[PDB]
A paper describes a structure:
Transcriptional co-regulators of the SRO group are characterized by a conserved PARP domain and a C-terminal RST (RCD1 SRO TAF4) domain that binds transcription factors. We present a structural analysis of the Ta-sro1 PARP domain at 2.1 Å resolution together with in vitro and in vivo assays of biochemical function, providing strong evidence that Ta-sro1 is unlikely to have PARP activity.
The donor site loop (D-loop) occludes the proposed active site of Ta-sro1 and is only partially resolved in the structure with little interpretable electron density for amino acids Met334–Gly336. The structure confirms that the His–Tyr–Glu triad is not conserved in Ta-sro1. The position of the conserved His residue is taken by Ta-sro1 Leu312. The Tyr that stacks with the nicotinamide ribose ring in canonical PARP enzymes is replaced by His344 in Ta-sro1. The catalytic Glu that is specifically required for the PAR chain elongating polymerase activity of PARPs is replaced by Ta-sro1 His407. Thr343 (Ala in Ta-SRO1) is located close to the proposed active site and its side chain is positioned toward the hydrophobic core of the protein formed by residues Leu345, Val330, Leu328, Ile419, Val415, and Ile410. However, our Ta-sro1 PARP domain crystal structure reveals that the Ta-sro1 Thr343 side chain points in the opposite direction and toward a hydrophobic area forming the basis of the postulated NAD+-binding site. The second polymorphic amino acid, Val250 (Gly in Ta-SRO1) is positioned on the opposite side of the domain and located close to the N-terminus of the crystallized construct.
Numbering used by the authors: 250 to 332, 337 to 431
């Protein structure tokens, strides 16, 4: 559903955003450089995790972006991550924490923030400690990390899974407020 982006952005959490703050919302490319349909690949990965774990645990999440990394996606279908003290991996904010991902993302010279709404295959999650140097699942039973099992504020995707479990779906460009 197209409305889900503004749904999460404007009315989602306690802190809202305004339409004037949204510079752009854009779909990501359908194929990567090598012509593979990106959504179909993600569906394939979704089915594989579902069959292995019993549930794929697909979430919406916000990926902090720089100008360059958004360009890699929007020009070439390539996923690049910018450098969240919870392990060595890709850190994402839960769907309702766009303001948190906003407060934890960079603001450039033109007063602009960038982020991407992704569907993420999390699979089985475990706790990652703050300041942890973890870079992979603890053991074969887990796939991804959270900072808190009851009240997650951060999702963590390990390097080995970034190219198969993160599907960037919308690019979002926001003007710093007022």
């Amino acid at each position: 559903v197209d409305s889900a982006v503004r749904k999460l952005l404007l009315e989602g959490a306690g802190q809202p955003f305004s339409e004037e703050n949204i510079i752009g919302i854009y779909r990501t490319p359908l194929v990567d450089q090598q012509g593979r349909a990106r959504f179909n690949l993600f569906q394939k990965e979704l089915e594989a995790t579902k069959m292995h774990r019993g549930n794929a645990n697909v979430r919406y999440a916000w990926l902090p972006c720089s100008k360059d990394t958004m360009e890699e996606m929007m020009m070439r279908g390539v996923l690049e991550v910018t450098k969240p003290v919870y392990g060595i991996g890709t850190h994402l904010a839960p769907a309702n924490c766009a303001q948190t991902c906003a407060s934890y993302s960079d603001i450039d010279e033109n007063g602009i923030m960038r982020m991407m709404l992704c569907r993420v295959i999390m699979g089985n999650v475990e706790v990652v400690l703050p300041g942890s140097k973890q870079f992979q699942p603890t053991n074969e039973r887990f796939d991804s990390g959270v900072d808190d099992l009851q009240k997650p504020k951060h999702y963590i995707i390990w390097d080995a899974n970034v190219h198969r479990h993160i599907y960037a779906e919308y690019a979002v460009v926001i003007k710093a407020p007022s």
